[PDB]
Assembly symmetry: C6
Homo-oligomer: 173 residues x 6
């Protein structure tokens, strides 16, 4: 049952790309304009927002998508050159795809966790002592985070199934 | 009378996609900037808006559209793979489409109801006791909600008609 | 003269679609941001604007365009299905197009009238008693309304001419 | 010399379309947000702006372009219909194009004049007595107005030359 | 060595078009929003900005690009018409291109100079006596101005080289 | 193996172009609106922002991408011209590409360094003495800077490998 694996993998990849490309930018549009802190100190908003969200989720997901798609591009361009052998490059492509997917999933978990809290406690200069700041659309962002994690997990499972189907003896050679 | 069913189903799907893609983003553009609460507490607006609208209607509808279209994509890519059998995958595709459509309709009803009230009563921290907040374009959003519900219901009816036409004996086998 | 009527009908349909798609969104961009009421009560602007304009003109016109174009799409997809009889579906398509056009014209008249006044008197909660609100670009909106009404009337006349040419005896059967 | 007349006419039409489509929207983006009146009365800005600029230049020019292009569309669709005679429709097309171009040029002159003043005197309700308002980018708008007038005049001259070349005897018949 | 001249000319033209189309609009987006004058007089900002920048650089460059490309369009359409002689139109096309390029370069120099100062002294009504106004991103605009001047100069040199290659005897005839 | 070297070079070039075109504009959208200085002097924000960021990173990267792609365009157009010899232009194209890449990398290092500080100290007129200003999203910009530097370094290494493979004897001739 390897053909169904590839079918589902392609469908899931397209689904993830479409969802991101259509809604991600709109969800994270006013992340900084609607981020407000309870203070009068100029520049506290910028520092506290920067500490709270070092990298926006959408940038990370775009980078992940492009990086995960890279090996297929490598294989396609190698095939194009080879005309005007290919049974070995495929195994290395699969291995690299597996590694990249697993790494990106683990990185997302270690970077963002599983939820976006509605309050933040900030103690960065120039803010005096400790201040409280309020986030925009925490619930929608939490839902988006969980959904992306689930899709990435499905992709990882399918890739592992494909790699196992190929077998360890072929991978070693 | 199965051909007219498929014709109407395709027309309705295209109609829904076009309507959403053309007007949905514009309708819900200033949902948060025009949402105002009667208070002086910083951060009350963000919390009350997040509680009032955990997920925007437009994103739910986009997700529904992509998810409902997925099975056709799976069938098409399976057909492409088969060339360079198909009379059985079709039944499962129809069943899954029916299930997804019914589930999404029920979920919409249980999430949003049938109207968008013009006032909201919010008692979430940091707001003090109860505060009153005012929504933007409640009537247009109500009309959009009802129209989308009606279109989804028509799609459900057509899908059920198709499934019944196929017959229970074929579905069992 | 049915064929020359068809030529004119196609030209006017394309003209209407182009005009809407190019200028409608820009005209109605700042309808709510520039709508101001003479009061200090929070939330009066939102309620009064919602009462004044339950549905924006542009969205109504987009819906009308798609709905009017639907029957041609149904006929085209039926023709595609028939290959890989057609002289009867055409009459029903014409009748439905006529009915839809007339209904949309009447609905526009009953919903918006023939002008957009520059002042509005609003007595909706939370506004205290009666307040006065001021509209944005009333004259441009009036011109747009009249122009769309005229184009729709021309389309109705051409459709009626075509239906009359087909004759009542054919329509009956 | 009819070859060069048609060549220049086509080039000029394309030039005008490109210039409008590329710069018109950007020039007139902040016409109303940067329009300011010297008063404290709410609603005076809206009324005075509406009186000063009943119709924006860009929308008038877009309407003119589409209307002027319409006869060519009619001729092309008639030619398409005729396949799956044409030596007469061409003369009427030319006459209608000439009439439309001349009418639009005269209308522009009578609507906007030749310059956009930097100050406006407004005495419209609710403004008290007479107030002074200030326009945004008057000089760029004046340049755009003059350039469009010159291009339209060139088009009119070329169309008149073409019509004269056809001759009065043919036009009469 | 004429082929290299044409190759470099085409490459430079494409380079200029790409650079403008990609960055010009973004650079000059907030030219008027961030232009601030030290005064309390309403309407002083509009008048002083209009006096400082009668025409934005980006619009001048767009006009220059289209005008310079026009003669090639004229030649191409003449060639297209000629099928369903050409060795003479080419010389006039080259001469007109040279003249247009030189004229636009000189006009840019006489209009904008070589730098955008960071301060402006304005004495236009309604501003009282002299006021000081501050520009947005003077350095980026200076860099853009110098770069465009250099590219236009390279184009002028290449066009002059081509024209000289053709020779004076051929041009005279 | 330059074959796989060229494969990797093409893949990394496409990767860089995609990343820039998709995220660069969004990251640097509100660079100036969110830049705030601790002062009351009008015009201090503009001057201090201009001194802090003479040229935005995104524009520099766009210019670098187009300039680096230019030699391939020159070679392609020369090949097109040659039809309706080519073994020497390739070496010069490679040399020029190497030089451009190295120059742009060095320029980026000397212009921006390796980090974007969160505070800036500004002493430019009209600001009185020395003032403190606060940057927007310093961490995301630092990450972007480092990532672009790494990608450019990889491209430089691959280009150097290709040039070395071609050999010094061929380059000399
Ligand atoms: C005018 C369009 C702009 C809007 N987004 C930012 C740059 C462009 C395009 C891009 C988006 O439409 C988009 C298109 C295609 N693929 C995408 C893939 C990912 C993505 O992530 C935000 C956005 C994508
Ligand atoms: C510059 C264009 C941007 C505007 N919207 C957000 C990202 C892109 C595209 C998309 C919209 O045009 C759009 C296009 C196509 N299909 C769509 C399907 C659904 C949709 O839901 C809002 C929007 C769609
Ligand atoms: C980035 C582009 C966005 C701008 N408008 C909203 C969603 C998209 C597209 C659409 C408009 O360009 C448009 C395109 C094509 N047909 C249209 C038909 C009707 C229409 O009514 C406003 C707008 C149309
Ligand atoms: C996202 C794109 C939007 C920007 N303008 C408003 C609606 C759309 C398209 C249109 C413009 O690009 C445009 C394209 C093509 N032809 C045009 C013709 C005239 C025009 O006048 C403003 C604008 C045109
Ligand atoms: C949604 C897109 C809009 C953005 N700019 C204004 C109108 C349209 C297109 C245009 C720009 O993308 C553009 C495209 C193609 N050629 C251009 C050539 C010149 C240019 O100068 C600003 C802008 C160009
Ligand atoms: C409506 C679209 C506008 C958005 N950006 C500014 C002008 C246009 C296009 C461009 C961007 O989509 C884009 C497209 C394609 N290639 C690009 C390459 C580089 C780039 O750097 C910001 C932006 C690119």
């Amino acid at each position: 049952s390897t053909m169904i694996g590839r079918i589902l993998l392609t469908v899931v990849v397209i689904f993830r790309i479409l969802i991101v490309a259509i809604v991600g930018e709109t969800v994270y549009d006013d992340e900084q304009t609607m981020f407000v802190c309870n203070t009068l100190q100029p520049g506290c908003n910028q520092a506290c927002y920067d500490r709270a969200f070092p990298i926006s989720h959408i940038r990370y997901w775009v980078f992940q998508i492009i990086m995960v798609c890279t090996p297929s591009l490598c294989f396609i361009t190698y095939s194009v050159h080879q005309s005007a052998g290919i049974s070995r490059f495929y195994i290395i492509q699969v291995v690299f795809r597996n590694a990249l997917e697993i790494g990106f999933l683990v990185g997302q978990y270690f970077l963002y966790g599983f939820s976006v809290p509605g309050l933040y406690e900030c103690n960065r200069y120039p803010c005096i002592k400790e201040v409280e700041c309020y986030v925009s659309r925490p619930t929608e962002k939490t839902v988006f985070l969980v959904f992306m994690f689930a899709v990435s997990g499905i992709c990882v499972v399918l890739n592992l199934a494909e790699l196992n189907h190929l077998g360890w003896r072929k991978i070693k050679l």
